[PDB]
Amino acid sequence: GVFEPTIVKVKSLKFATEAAITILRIDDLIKLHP
């Protein structure tokens, strides 16, 4: 009886992958003084 809605895992994967791609595309960072 350990059930989870499919949408949970599916959306978890999709969102995690998009976030990982977004962060994994950064190869430089310019932090400007306020």
Partner: protein, 42 residues
């Protein structure tokens, strides 16, 4: 003629080189964002 028209200032040349250096630095900066294998900047 011989000697030649002598440049007195050398500050114009310094300005030219400073501008060229700044421009090349900006290019070198955004040179890895070019192309399909190019990456993003934050």
């Amino acid at each position: 003629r011989g000697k030649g028209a002598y440049q007195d200032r050398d500050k114009p040349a310094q300005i030219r080189f400073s501008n060229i250096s700044a421009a090349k630095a900006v290019a070198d900066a955004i040179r890895t964002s070019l192309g399909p294998k190019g990456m993003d900047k934050m």
